[PDB]
C-alpha cells in the first residue's frame, strides 16, 4: 500500500499521490499558522510570529510578503520554498502587468502558482513547495479576494481561510463565525481573524507575537499594520 | 392540436355532469379522428378518454362493453401499445367492480403478450394487478409470487412515484395478510404514504390507515396517536384517523366494549376495508381470548354469567367463545350448560408409561407375526 | 529477472518485454482479413457494445490510410491511434514526394521500422498494436499484411489477430481455397469464422463490421459495410446453416 | 504482479499497463460528474460540494468552456483539469486560427485524447488523473465524449464518471431515452447526481453546463436553484 | 466526565438505555502522565487499575488466536474486576491489514457486563485509522 | 471404561452461554438477506423433509458481501442464537499464521470439529485476506495463502463429503475472490447486503431507538428523509452518539438537538480528503 | 442452450436452485421458466462495470 510514495509521478493502486501528501504535511513544518478573513469591503491576514531569539532582527522575521502593489501574500510552511514561491508570484505578476497593461488580479495570481505547481506534480523533476499561499487582493467589481494555493496545485477562493499546524480548528472557528450573518466591518474582520487565532492558540497575544496585513476597499493597497496597530486592535477586542 | 384538446375538455366537462351514453358517442365520434394524428397521441387521448369516462360513478353496466369494443376497434386496427393499455384498465375495472375471475383470466392470458414486449412498466402494473387478486381470492402464495415477480420487474426500469407508491402499497398489503413480521408491513405501508403524498393521490389517506393498522399489530398502540401527530398526517387527519385512534385507545385498555362501541360508530371505515375489518377481527378475538384467560386464572367452577359481567359481552357470545377455546385445544376445561359453569382442571399428562405399553403391545404383535412366518418350517 | 526493459536481452537472446506485447495482443478484440479474386476485406467485433455507447465513428476498428489502402486495429486504443495518424503522414509524404500512391508492403514496412524502434531504444515501450493491412498497387495487385508489436510484418492471404485468433486461422486454413476464392465467398469465410470465433451466439449484426476493398474502373473504391448487408449476410449464414442441418 | 505497478513504459507479463489503470481508479475516487445527450443538445453536470462554507463557491468552476460551442466537465484530479481545460482551450485556438472555423468537437477530442496520451508515454511524468466529458454542437447535431487518461476516448450517449459511477450507469438505461430534449435531459443529470449527491443540492453545490446550438453555456445558479426546485 | 458514570452510575446508561462506552483514547505524547491520570482516577474510585503487559492478557497478537482470547477475558473483568489498558501504545492504533482485521474482532464490541475497557494512549495521531473511530 | 466425550470449546465451538444474545427481532429489516439465510442455514436443519421432497441437496455454503458495517457479522450473529446445531465463529484471520501449514491445519480442524459435532454452522467471518484470487504464487508466503484458500476449498466440497454442516462466509466487494470459492458445489448462494435505503433505515432507526428513551420532539423520520448514504453500523453510532450528548448535558431524555449533533458529527467523512482527490 | 459453456457444478447448482424456487413456493413440481430463471441466477457474471479500463484494449 505504502510501497508507492517514494516519486510524485507514481499512482498507487487506489489512485493517490502520496508524495502530494507529504508536501501538504510538510506544510505544518513551519510550526505557525496563519488566518485570513475576507470582510465586506475588506480582506485580513494575521500570522504567528514566533522569534524565540533575542538575536534575530524582528523586522526581516516577517511571513508577510507583498507580492505587488495592491495584492499581498502570507506564507506557510519551510521559510525558502515560501521565499521562492513569493518571488515566483512577484515575476508572474510583473509578467502580467507587462504583457497586458492592468494590474493582476489575485485570481490569477493564485491559479499561476497552481499551474506552476501542477506542473511540478506532473513532471518528476523539482520537488514540490511545500509552502502554501495565501493572498489578498482589492479586484475591481469583485470587492475584497482571499485566496489559498496549495502545494498539489489547487488554487480555492474563500470567505476565511487558515493554514499551519492549527488549521482544522481555525477553520472550524471560522465555520461556526462565517454563518451568524454580521456587519463585516474592518475592524469585525481584524476582530474575527484575532479571535480564531488566539481561541486556536489560547495565547495573550502580546503585539509583537503576531503580524497582521490588511488590504480595503478604501485603500486597495496591501498594508501591514505597525505595533502600536495591532495594540489597538487588540486592546478593542478585549473590551 | 385543437381538435384534440376540444375533445378532451368536452370529455372533462361531460364527466363533471356525467352523461354517459354521451361520453360513449362522442369517444365512438371521435374514432375517424384518431387514424388521422399519429400512434402515441392517439394512445394517450383514448387513454384520457376512457379514464374520465370510467372514473364517475355512472354504474350502467356499459363499461366493461365500452372496453370490449375499444379492444376490438384496437384489433381491428392493430394498435398492439393501446390494445394492451385498454386490456391492463380492464383488469383494473374487473378487480374493482369484484369480478375477480374473468380479472385473473384476463392477466393470466395478457402476461405472455406483455412478457414479450418490452414495456415493462405496463407488465409490472399488471403483475401487481394479479397480485391484487390473487390476495383478494385468498390465494396468499400465488399473490406473493405475482407481488415478487412484480418487483423484480420494477427494479429494472424508472418506476414513477405512482407505480413505486403501489408497489409498495402491495408489499405491505402482502406483509400484512401473512401474519408472521409487522414491522416490515408497517415500513412499506410507510414507504407506499410517502410515495402517495408525493403525488398528493387519494390512496395515501389510505396508506396511513394502513400504518396506524400495523401500529396496532405489535402491541404498541400508543404511537398511532404520535403518527396521527406527524408533520404528513396533520393535513390527512379526518373521521378515519380517529377511528383508528380509539381503536388503538381500545386496544391499549383492553376494553372490548370500547372496541365494539369504535368498530359501530366508525362501520363505514372499519368494515368497509377487507384489510381493516379482517385484520381488526383477528385483533378483537386475540383480545378475547386473552382476557377471558386473564379472568379465568382465578376461578374454578365461575358461571358464565359472572364471566360475561366481568368482561362485558354477552353470555351467548362469550359461551361460543369459551367453547371455541375448548375445542381448539386451547385453556383445559369443560362447560356444564345444565347449571352454568365452565370447570378447570390440571389436564393429567398422559401416563407415557402407558402409551410406551401400547407400543410394545403393537411390537409384538409383530413379533408374533413374524413368528408366524416361523414355524412354517414345522 | 530480465523484462524490466525493453532492451535487456534474455540469456536465450528472448526480448521478454516484446513478447509481453505480443502476448498483450490477444486482449484485443478479434479482427480479421481475407484475400480473393478482385477483393479483399477485413471484419472485427465491437467488443464493448453497450447500449449507452453512441456509434459515431462508423470504423472504431477500421481505418482509411491511402486511397487504396486500409488497416485494421487491434491493441492499445493509444498506440493504435498513433500508429494510423503516423501511418496516414507517412502516405501522404509519399504521395506528395512521388506522386503515386505507395505500393501498400511499403508503408507497412515504414511504419514496421518505427514500431522496430521502440523495441530497441530505452525509455520508450514497445507499441502493443498489431494490425492488418489491405489494399491495391501497380506492382502486386490485392496485398494482405500483418504486423506486430515487435515491428515484424509478413504477407498473408487469410490470417486474424486478437482474441481467438489461433482458432480462426485454423478455420481460415481448413476453409481457403487459394486463387478460386471471391469477394461473395470471401464474405461468407468471414462471417462464419467470426461466428465461430466470436463466443456470442447468432453473431449480431452490430456487434461485427466489415469492411472491403475492391477496384472499380480504376477507382480502388474502400466500402465500409452498412449494417443493412451485414443483416443479410448473417440470414444468409443462418440459412446455410439451417441447410447443413437437413444431413440429420 | 505488483513489480510491473511503477514503470508507465514496461508491460505486465499479462501484458496489461498498471498505472494507467490507477490513473483510472484515481478517476473513479473522484466527484461525481454526469453527462447525457438528448436530441437537443448535451448536458454536463458535476457535484461542487465543498469541504464548508468557507470555500468560495463561485471562485472556481468546474464545468468550463472550450469554445463558443463546446463545453468540458471531468472527473479526477482537479489540478490537471485546469491544464488540461488550458491545453483545449489553446488547440481549440490553434484550430480556429488554422482553418477559421469553429473546431469540430470530435477533432478536439482526438486532439485533448492525444495530448493526454503524451502523458503516459515517459518513465518521470505522470499520466493525467482526470476524465474529460467534452459536449459540442456542430453540423446541427449534439456530441458527447468521454477522453481518458489512457487517451482512449469513445462517444457516450449517456454516462457518469466519479464516485458511484456505476449507480449513475444503473440509473441510465432507465430514465434515459434517445428521444428526449435539453430540459428532460436536464432533469435527467440532476435526478442520477442525486443518486450519488449526500445532502441538499444547493444551487451553489452543482454545475450544470447546456450544449445546444446556440453554443455551450454554463448555467446560473438562478437557472440551477429552478431546475431543483422543479425536480424536488 | 468519560469514565467515572461508568464506574459511579452505571444505572444512568440504562436510564437513558445506551451500552455504556467503551474505547476512549487518550491519545498524547508518551511520558506526560497517561498512566499516571489514569492511576489517578483510579485511586480516586480506589478500583483495581489493571493495565495490561501483553503477558496473559495479549489478544491481537497472532501467534496464537483463541487461546490468548480466552486469557484477555479471563484473567481481567471475570477475575480482576474492572479497569483495564494496553501496552505497546502506539501498536496496535496505528500481514498487517490481517493483523487490523483480528484487531477489530477483539475489540469490536463485548458483553457489558464484564468490563474491557480500552483506554488507549497512542502516542501520535497519524497512527490511527477510520476503522476505529466508530463509537 | 470410557469417558464421557470431553468435547469443549477447542478452538470457538460457542457454547450455551456465549449465544451473542441477538436475534431476529434485534436486525432491522433485512428481509431478503434474513430470507436467504434462513432457507440456506436454518431451514434445512429443521425442516430437511422438504428438501427431501424436491431432492435437490440443499445448499452448504453462503456468502453475504456488501459494504462494511451493513449487519453481515451480526446476521451471522443472530444465525447463531436461533440455532439448534453447533456453531463456530471464526474470521480469516486466525487462520494466517507463522510456521507454514498451520492455518491449513487450523481449517481442517475447524471443519473436522464441525464434522464431530453435526449438526454444525461454520460462520467464516471477513475473508478478503484468505480468500484472494489465486493468481501465480512465487514467493512463501502467497503460496501458504493459496495453500490456506485450497484446503478451504476442499474441506467445504471434497473428496469427503461432510454433511450435515453449513459454511458462511463475509466479504466486502465479492469482485474478488477464487471462482472455485464461487463455485455453486462450494459457495452456492451469495446473498448482497447493501445500504440501508429509505424503507431500511427507517426500520434500523425503529429497532435501535425503540429501546432508548428518545422524546415526543425527536421525529426520527427527519433523519430517515435525508439523502445521505448511511449503513446500519452508521445509524447504531449515530443513535449512541445522541444518547451521550443527551447524558453528557445531564439529561435523561433524548432531545432533538442532540440528534441532530450527533447526525451532523457521524455524517462528516470527508476529514482531509486534500481537497484536490475530492 | 440456456448454459452456454458451464462447469458441471453449475448445472448441479442450476437444479439446486429451481428446487429452492419450488421451495419457496411451498411446491413440489419444478417448472421450466423456473429452470431457466434459477439457470439465469447461477450464471451471474461480474463484468469490468467500467467502460474506461474495458476501452483500454480497442
Ligand atoms: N502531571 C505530572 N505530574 C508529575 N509527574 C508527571 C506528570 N506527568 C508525567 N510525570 C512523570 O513522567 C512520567 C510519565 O510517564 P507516562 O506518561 O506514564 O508514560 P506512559 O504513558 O508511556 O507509560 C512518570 O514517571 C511521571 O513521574
Ligand atoms: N438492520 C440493522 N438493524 C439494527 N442495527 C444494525 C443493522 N445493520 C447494522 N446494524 C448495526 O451495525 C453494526 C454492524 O456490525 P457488523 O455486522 O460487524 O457489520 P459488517 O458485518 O457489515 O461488518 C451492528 O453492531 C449493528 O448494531
Ligand atoms: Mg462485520
Not at chain 6, 54 to 81: E, F, N, Q, S, W
Amino acid at each position: 500500500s505504502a510501497g508507492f510514495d517514494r516519486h510524485i509521478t507514481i499512482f498507487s493502486p487506489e489512485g493517490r499521490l502520496y508524495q502530494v501528501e507529504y508536501a501538504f504535511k510538510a506544510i505544518n513544518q513551519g510550526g505557525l499558522t496563519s488566518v485570513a478573513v475576507r470582510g465586506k469591503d475588506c480582506a485580513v491576514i494575521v500570522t504567528q510570529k514566533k522569534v524565540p531569539d533575542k538575536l534575530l532582527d524582528s523586522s526581516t522575521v516577517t511571513h508577510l510578503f507583498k507580492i505587488t502593489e495592491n495584492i499581498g501574500c502570507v506564507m506557510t510552511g519551510m521559510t525558502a520554498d515560501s521565499r521562492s514561491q513569493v518571488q515566483r508570484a512577484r515575476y508572474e505578476a510583473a509578467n502580467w502587468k507587462y504583457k497586458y497593461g492592468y494590474e493582476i488580479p489575485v485570481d490569477m495570481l493564485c491559479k499561476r502558482i497552481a499551474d506552476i505547481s501542477q506542473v511540478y506534480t506532473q513532471n518528476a523533476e523539482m520537488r514540490p513547495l511545500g509552502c502554501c499561499m495565501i493572498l489578498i487582493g482589492i479586484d475591481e467589481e469583485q470587492g475584497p479576494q482571499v485566496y489559498k494555493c496549495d502545494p498539489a496545485g489547487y488554487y480555492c477562493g474563500f470567505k476565511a481561510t487558515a493554514a499551519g499546524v492549527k488549521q482544522t480548528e481555525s477553520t472550524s472557528f471560522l465555520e461556526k463565525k462565517v454563518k451568524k450573518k454580521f456587519d463585516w466591518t474592518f475592524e469585525q474582520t481584524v476582530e474575527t481573524a484575532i479571535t480564531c487565532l488566539s481561541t486556536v492558540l489560547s495565547i495573550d497575544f502580546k503585539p509583537s507575537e503576531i503580524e497582521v496585513g490588511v488590504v480595503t476597499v478604501e485603500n486597495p493597497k496591501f498594508r501591514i499594520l505597525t505595533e502600536a496597530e495591532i495594540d489597538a486592535h487588540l486592546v478593542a477586542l478585549a473590551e | 392540436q385543437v381538435k384534440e384538446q376540444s375533445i378532451l375538455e368536452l370529455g372533462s366537462l361531460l364527466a363533471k355532469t356525467g352523461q354517459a351514453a354521451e361520453l360513449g358517442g362522442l369517444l365512438k365520434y371521435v374514432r375517424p379522428f384518431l387514424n388521422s394524428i399519429s400512434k402515441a397521441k392517439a394512445a394517450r387521448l383514448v387513454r384520457s378518454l376512457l379514464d374520465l369516462f370510467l372514473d364517475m360513478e355512472a354504474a350502467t353496466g356499459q363499461e366493461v362493453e365500452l372496453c370490449l369494443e375499444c379492444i376490438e376497434w384496437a384489433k381491428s386496427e392493430k394498435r398492439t401499445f393501446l390494445r394492451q393499455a385498454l386490456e391492463a384498465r380492464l383488469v383494473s375495472l374487473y378487480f374493482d367492480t369484484k369480478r375477480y375471475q374473468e380479472a385473473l383470466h384476463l392477466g393470466s392470458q395478457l402476461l405472455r403478450e406483455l412478457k414479450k414486449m418490452d414495456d415493462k412498466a405496463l407488465l409490472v402494473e399488471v403483475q401487481l394487478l394479479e397480485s391484487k387478486t390473487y390476495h383478494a381470492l385468498s390465494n396468499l402464495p400465488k399473490a406473493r409470487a405475482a407481488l415478487t415477480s412484480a418487483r423484480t420487474t420494477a427494479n429494472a426500469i424508472y418506476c414513477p412515484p405512482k407505480l413505486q407508491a403501489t408497489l409498495d402499497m402491495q408489499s405491505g398489503i402482502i406483509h400484512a395478510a401473512e401474519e408472521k413480521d409487522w414491522k416490515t408491513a408497517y415500513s412499506y405501508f410507510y414507504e407506499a404514504f410517502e410515495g402517495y403524498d408525493s403525488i398528493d393521490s387519494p390512496k395515501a389517506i389510505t396508506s396511513l390507515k394502513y400504518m396506524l393498522l400495523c401500529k396496532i399489530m405489535l402491541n404498541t398502540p400508543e404511537d398511532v396517536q404520535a403518527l396521527v401527530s406527524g408533520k404528513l398526517a396533520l393535513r390527512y387527519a379526518g373521521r378515519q384517523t380517529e377511528a383508528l385512534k380509539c381503536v388503538a385507545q381500545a386496544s391499549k385498555n383492553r376494553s372490548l366494549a370500547d372496541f365494539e362501541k369504535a368498530l359501530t360508530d366508525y362501520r363505514a371505515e372499519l368494515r368497509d376495508d377487507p384489510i381493516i375489518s379482517t385484520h381488526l377481527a383477528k385483533l378483537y378475538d386475540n383480545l378475547l381470548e386473552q382476557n377471558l384467560i386473564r379472568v379465568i386464572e382465578p376461578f374454578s367452577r365461575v358461571q358464565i354469567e359472572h364471566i360475561s359481567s366481568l368482561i362485558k359481552l354477552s353470555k351467548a357470545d362469550v359461551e361460543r367463545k369459551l367453547s371455541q377455546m375448548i375445542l381448539d385445544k386451547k385453556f383445559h376445561g369443560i362447560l356444564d350448560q345444565g347449571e352454568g359453569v365452565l370447570i378447570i382442571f390440571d389436564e393429567p399428562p398422559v401416563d407415557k408409561t402407558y402409551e410406551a405399553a401400547l407400543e410394545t403391545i403393537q411390537n409384538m404383535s409383530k413379533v408374533v407375526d413374524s413368528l408366524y412366518n416361523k414355524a412354517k418350517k414345522l | 529477472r530480465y523484462d524490466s526493459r525493453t532492451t535487456i536481452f534474455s540469456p536465450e537472446g528472448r526480448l521478454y518485454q516484446v513478447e509481453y506485447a505480443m502476448e498483450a495482443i490477444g486482449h484485443a478484440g478479434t479482427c480479421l482479413g481475407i484475400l480473393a479474386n478482385d477483393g479483399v476485406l477485413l471484419a472485427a467485433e465491437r467488443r464493448n457494445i453497450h447500449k449507452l455507447l453512441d456509434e459515431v465513428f462508423f470504423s472504431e476498428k477500421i481505418y482509411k490510410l491511402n486511397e487504396d489502402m486500409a488497416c485494421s486495429v487491434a491493441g492499445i486504443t493509444s498506440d493504435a491511434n498513433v500508429l494510423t495518424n503516423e501511418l496516414r503522414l507517412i502516405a501522404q509524404r509519399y504521395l506528395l514526394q512521388y506522386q503515386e500512391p505507395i505500393p501498400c508492403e511499403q508503408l507497412v514496412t515504414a511504419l514496421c521500422d518505427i514500431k522496430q524502434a521502440y523495441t530497441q531504444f530505452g525509455g520508450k515501450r514497445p507499441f502493443g498494436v498489431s494490425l492488418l493491412y489491405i489494399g491495391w498497387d501497380k506492382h502486386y495487385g490485392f496485398q494482405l499484411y500483418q504486423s506486430d508489436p515487435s515491428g515484424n510484418y509478413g504477407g498473408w492471404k487469410a490470417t486474424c489477430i486478437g482474441n481467438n485468433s489461433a482458432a480462426a486461422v485454423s478455420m481460415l486454413k481448413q476453409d481457403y481455397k487459394e486463387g478460386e476464392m471471391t469477394l461473395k465467398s470471401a464474405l461468407a469465410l468471414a462471417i462464419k469464422v467470426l461466428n465461430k470465433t466470436m463466443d456470442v451466439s447468432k453473431l449480431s449484426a452490430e456487434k461485427v463490421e466489415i469492411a472491403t476493398l475492391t477496384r472499380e474502373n480504376g477507382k480502388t473504391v474502400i466500402r465500409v459495410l452498412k449494417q443493412k448487408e451485414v443483416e443479410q449476410l448473417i440470414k444468409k449464414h443462418e440459412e446455410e446453416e439451417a441447410k447443413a442441418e437437413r444431413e440429420k | 504482479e505488483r513489480g510491473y505497478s511503477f514503470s508507465l513504459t514496461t508491460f505486465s507479463p499479462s501484458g496489461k499497463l498498471v498505472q494507467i489503470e490507477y490513473a483510472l481508479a484515481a478517476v473513479a475516487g473522484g466527484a461525481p460528474s454526469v453527462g447525457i445527450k438528448a436530441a437537443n443538445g448535451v448536458v454536463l453536470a458535476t457535484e461542487k460540494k465543498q469541504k464548508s462554507i468557507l470555500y468560495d463557491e463561485r471562485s472556481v468552476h468546474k464545468v468550463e468552456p472550450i469554445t463558443k460551442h463546446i463545453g468540458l466537465v471531468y472527473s479526477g484530479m482537479g489540478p490537471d483539469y485546469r491544464v488540461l481545460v488550458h491545453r483545449a482551450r489553446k488547440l481549440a485556438q490553434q484550430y480556429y486560427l488554422v482553418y477559421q472555423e469553429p473546431i469540430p468537437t470530435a477533432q478536439l477530442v482526438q486532439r485533448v485524447a492525444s495530448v493526454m496520451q503524451e502523458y503516459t508515454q515517459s518513465g518521470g511524468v505522470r499520466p493525467f488523473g482526470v476524465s474529460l466529458l467534452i459536449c459540442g454542437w456542430n453540423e446541427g447535431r449534439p456530441y458527447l465524449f468521454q477522453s481518458d487518461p489512457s487517451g482512449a476516448y469513445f462517444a457516450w450517449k449517456a454516462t457518469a464518471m466519479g464516485k458511484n459511477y456505476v449507480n449513475g450507469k444503473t440509473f441510465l438505461e432507465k430514465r434515459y431515452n434517445e428521444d428526449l430534449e435539453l430540459e428532460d435531459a436536464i432533469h435527467t443529470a440532476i435526478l442520477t447526481l442525486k443518486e450519488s449527491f449526500e445532502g441538499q443540492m444547493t444551487e451553489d453545490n452543482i454545475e450544470v453546463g447546456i450544449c445546444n446550438e446556440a453554443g455551450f453555456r454554463r448555467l446560473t445558479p438562478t437557472e440551477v436553484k429552478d431546475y431543483l426546485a422543479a425536480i424536488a | 466526565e468519560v469514565i467515572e458514570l461508568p464506574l459511579t452510575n452505571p444505572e444512568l446508561f440504562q436510564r437513558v438505555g445506551i451500552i455504556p462506552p467503551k474505547g476512549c483514547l487518550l491519545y498524547g505524547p508518551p511520558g506526560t502522565g497517561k498512566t499516571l491520570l489514569a492511576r489517578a482516577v483510579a485511586s480516586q474510585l480506589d478500583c483495581n487499575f489493571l493495565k495490561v503487559v501483553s503477558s496473559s492478557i495479549v489478544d491481537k497478537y497472532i501467534g496464537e488466536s483463541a487461546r490468548l482470547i480466552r486469557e484477555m477475558f479471563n484473567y481481567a473483568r471475570d477475575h480482576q474486576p474492572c479497569i483495564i489498558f494496553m501496552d505497546e501504545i502506539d501498536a496496535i492504533g496505528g500481514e498487517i491489514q490481517r493483523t487490523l482485521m483480528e484487531l477489530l474482532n477483539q475489540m469490536d464490541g463485548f458483553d457489558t457486563l464484564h468490563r474491557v475497557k480500552m483506554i488507549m494512549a497512542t502516542n501520535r495521531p497519524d497512527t490511527l485509522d477510520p476503522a476505529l473511530l466508530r463509537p | 471404561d470410557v469417558l464421557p466425550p470431553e468435547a469443549d470449546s477447542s478452538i470457538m465451538m460457542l457454547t450455551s452461554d456465549q449465544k451473542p444474545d441477538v436475534m431476529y427481532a434485534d436486525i432491522g429489516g433485512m428481509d431478503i438477506q434474513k430470507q436467504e439465510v434462513r432457507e440456506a442455514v436454518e431451514l434445512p436443519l429443521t425442516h430437511f423433509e422438504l428438501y427431501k421432497q424436491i431432492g435437490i441437496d440443499p445448499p452448504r455454503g453462503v456468502l453475504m458481501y456488501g459494504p462494511p458495517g451493513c449487519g453481515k457479522t451480526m446476521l451471522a450473529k443472530a444465525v447463531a442464537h436461533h440455532t439448534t446445531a453447533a456453531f463456530i465463529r471464526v474470521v480469516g484471520s486466525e487462520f494466517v499464521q507463522k510456521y507454514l501449514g498451520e492455518g491449513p491445519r487450523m481449517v481442517r480442524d475447524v471443519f473436522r470439529l464441525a464434522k464431530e459435532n453435526a449438526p454444525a454452522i461454520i460462520f467464516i467471518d471477513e475473508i478478503d485476506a484468505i480468500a484472494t484470487k489465486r493468481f501465480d504464487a512465487q514467493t512463501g508466503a502467497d503460496r501458504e495463502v493459496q495453500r490456506i484458500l485450497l484446503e478451504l476449498l476442499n474441506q467445504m466440497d471434497g473428496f469427503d463429503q461432510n454433511v450435515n454442516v453449513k459454511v458462511i462466509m463475509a466479504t466486502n466487494r465479492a469482485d474478488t475472490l477464487d471462482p472455485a470459492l464461487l463455485r455453486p458445489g462450494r459457495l452456492d448462494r451469495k446473498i448482497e447486503f447493501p445500504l440501508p435505503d429509505r424503507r431500511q433505515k427507517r426500520l434500523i432507526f425503529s429497532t435501535i431507538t425503540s429501546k432508548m428513551n428518545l422524546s415526543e420532539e425527536v421525529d426520527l423520520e427527519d433523519y430517515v428523509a435525508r439523502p445521505d448514504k448511511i449503513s446500519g453500523a452508521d445509524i447504531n453510532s449515530i443513535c449512541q452518539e445522541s444518547g451521550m450528548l443527551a447524558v453528557r448535558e445531564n439529561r435523561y431524555i433524548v432531545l432533538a438537538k442532540d440528534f441532530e449533533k450527533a447526525y451532523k458529527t457521524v455524517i462528516k467523512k470527508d476529514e482531509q480528503e486534500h481537497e484536490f482527490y475530492k | 442452450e440456456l448454459m452456454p459453456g458451464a462447469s458441471g457444478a453449475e448445472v448441479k447448482g442450476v437444479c439446486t436452485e429451481a428446487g429452492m424456487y419450488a421451495l419457496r413456493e411451498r411446491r413440489v413440481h419444478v417448472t421450466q421458466e423456473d429452470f431457466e430463471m434459477a439457470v439465469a441466477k447461477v450464471m451471474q457474471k461480474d463484468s469490468e462495470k467500467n467502460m474506461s479500463i474495458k476501452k483500454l484494449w480497442k
